[PDB]
Every structure is written in structure tokens, then in C-alpha cells.
From a paper:
In phylogenetically diverse bacteria, the conserved protein RapZ plays a central role in RNA-mediated regulation of amino-sugar metabolism. RapZ contributes to the control of glucosamine phosphate biogenesis by selectively presenting the regulatory small RNA GlmZ to the essential ribonuclease RNase E for inactivation. Here, we report the crystal structures of full length Escherichia coli RapZ at 3.40 Å and 3.25 Å, and its isolated C-terminal domain at 1.17 Å resolution. The structural data confirm that the N-terminal domain of RapZ possesses a kinase fold, whereas the C-terminal domain bears closest homology to a subdomain of 6-phosphofructokinase, an important enzyme in the glycolytic pathway.
Using limited proteolysis, the C-terminal half of RapZ (encompassing residues 154–284) was identified as a domain that could withstand digestion. Analysis by SEC-MALS (size-exclusion chromatography with multi-angle light scattering) and AUC (analytical ultracentrifugation) indicate that in isolation this protein domain is a homodimer. Well-ordered crystals were obtained of the purified RapZ-CTD, and a native dataset from a single crystal was collected at 1.17 Å resolution. Overall, the electron density was readily interpretable and allowed residues 156–281 to be modelled. The protein forms a crystallographic dimer with a symmetry-related copy, burying 1051.5 Å2 of solvent accessible surface area as determined by PISA analysis. This self-interacting interface is likely to account for the stable homodimer observed in solution. Of note are a cluster of basic residues around an extended loop on the surface of RapZ-CTD, including arginine 196 and lysines 251 and 281. During the process of modelling and refinement, clearly defined electron density for a non-protein ligand was observed in a pocket composed of the side chains of residues His190, His252, Arg253 and the backbone of Thr248 and Gly249. During optimization of the protein crystals, we found the addition of malonate to be extremely beneficial for crystal growth, and a malonate molecule accounts for this density excellently. RapZ-CTD unexpectedly exhibits distant structural homology to the fructose-6-phosphate binding domain of PFK, suggesting a common evolutionary origin.
Residue numbers in the entry:
A (entry chain A), B (entry chain A): 159 to 281
């Protein structure tokens, strides 16, 4: 079956070369100036809470998975092993990490074959 | 005002480094095996007609502009000069060219500041 890859990255490091879709989340609320959140990542509960208190964050996740679901039946049959969705913020530590996690969890919940990767955190 | 750039490219040449959003259209009907269409581009009427006879082509354009419109108000105010939407097929000659053109025409019709670019055709 098609493997759905959800990856976060920082635009400052360049777009990942395996991406098929790229979504920029630099318009979402930015935790960069709260000093307590700066050293954390979007895997951490305070950063997730900072993001989820804003309505547009859940709406971005919901609308993005809905958009992808329009094409998924045709992609699952596109001579294709992978569908790679890359979520980018500037540094790849906070917003993109959280959003990629939430998308990956949503598609896992739908029974899809999924994998996540955080390009900045893995360094 | 925010300048909306719509660019086509071929994944075989790599993702353009100025892209903010990237949409893969390799699942749309492929004119590669009709020999009359192969040397043409998505600027040409026979290629546009080949694509537009399939319902999913118009739906992709409509759904993609609608998705972008969810975020445009927040992007038009993201300390941002450009919003660059890159549409990719394998070679960047047919599907991506057509789709980028149609998106650019749609946002021009809404009074947005727009520019188009076809990375493969310009070579």
C-alpha cells in the first residue's frame, strides 16, 4: 500500500528533496519569542498547548487532511510507493513538528500506512 | 501587497527553491503517450482540452484555490512579500503548466497581485 510520510523541516535548511506536497505554516502563531518555549520542540506539551489554543491551528490540520483526502484515492493508485507531505516553518522545531505529528496521527487513525520524520530534530 | 507567484516545474529537475507551497499533480491524466501532445505544452489548446475533459482537473483547480483562500488573509499579513505556489509534474511541460496557468488566472480575476513562471518552458 501507499506509504504516507509526514515530515517537518525548516525552510532555512531547504525543502526536503523527497517531498511531493509542501505546506508552509509560517503564518500560524509563532512561539519564537516566548523564551520558555524556544528550547522546546513541537513534540513537547507546552508547545502543543501554545499552538492548540488558537483556532486556526486545528483548522489548518482539519483543512489540510481534508484537502489531501480529495486526492488520496487517485494517489493510492498512481504507480506510487510514497506520498510525502512536508510541513515547513522557519527552523523546523515548533510549528512544523506539531502539525506533521497531528497529520500523521490523523491518517494513522484512518488505518493508513504512515511514517513521520522531523528533519531538524533528527540532527 | 502580497505578490502571488504561480510556477510550474518538473520534479525531475528538483523543487524550486523559492516555493512556499508545492502541489504534486502527477495523479492527473497524463498526456505523455499521445504523440501529438508530447511536443506541445500546457499553454497549447490541445493539451488544455485533453486535461479539461476530465472532471478531476477542474476539481483540482477549484479545490486548490479554495484551500489557498483559507490562509490567504493570514498570509497577506505575515511580514511577507511573496506567496509562491509551485505545481509539479514529472517534466514540467504539460499538467503543471496548465494548472499553474489556471490558478494564476483565477487569482488575477479576484484582483490579486499575481505573476506566473514556467521553469521548464523558460529553458
Amino acid at each position: 500500500e501507499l506509504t504516507m510520510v509526514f515530515e517537518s523541516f525548516g525552510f532555512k535548511h531547504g525543502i526536503p528533496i523527497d517531498a511531493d506536497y509542501v505546506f508552509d505554516v509560517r503564518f500560524l502563531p509563532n512561539p519564537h519569542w516566548d523564551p520558555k518555549l524556544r528550547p522546546m520542540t513541537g513534540l513537547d506539551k507546552p508547545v502543543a498547548a501554545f499552538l492548540d489554543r488558537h483556532t486556526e491551528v486545528h483548522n489548518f490540520i482539519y483543512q489540510t487532511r481534508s484537502y489531501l483526502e480529495l486526492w488520496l484515492p487517485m494517489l493510492e493508485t498512481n504507480n506510487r510507493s510514497y506520498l510525502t507531505v512536508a510541513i515547513g516553518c522557519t527552523g523546523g522545531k515548533h510549528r512544523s513538528v506539531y502539525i506533521a505529528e497531528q497529520l500523521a496521527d490523523y491518517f494513522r487513525s484512518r488505518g493508513k500506512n504512515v511514517q513521520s520524520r522531523h528533519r531538524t530534530l533528527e540532527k
